[PDB]
């Protein structure tokens, strides 16, 4: 019934609806519309992998590489686990 607005995307959502949006340029979060008379939203990274090292957002199942602190290649995969978690092997 009540709506939340994304003025940057020109979109709107009803209470209880969830959508993805960028955050701080390169991150991604999942937002839910609460409403509460102010178009209030709650947004979370808990289902995403926002890796500061690579300044890239990954979805569950996405893979990427990066280095450790001694020149070794790490293979990373986004697992989520309700904790914005990922796992790398060195």
């Amino acid at each position: 019934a009540e709506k939340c607005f994304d003025h940057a995307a020109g979109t709107s959502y009803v209470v209880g609806e969830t959508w993805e949006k960028p955050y701080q340029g390169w991150m991604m979060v999942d937002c839910t519309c609460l409403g509460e008379g102010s178009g209030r939203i709650t947004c979370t990274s808990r289902n995403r992998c926002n890796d500061q090292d690579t300044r890239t957002s990954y979805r569950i199942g996405d893979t990427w590489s990066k280095k450790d602190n001694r020149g070794n290649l790490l293979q990373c995969i986004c697992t989520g686990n309700g904790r914005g978690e990922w796992k790398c092997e060195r």
Binding site: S38, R40, T42, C43, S45, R46, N50, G84, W86
Partner: peptide, 19 residues
């Protein structure tokens, strides 16, 4: 040898979208 590296970046925020 090397075990798995576990990393996390978990956060939440709220914001109003009507003034």
């Amino acid at each position: 040898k090397n075990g798995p590296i576990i990393q996390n970046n978990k956060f939440e925020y709220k914001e109003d979208t009507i003034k």
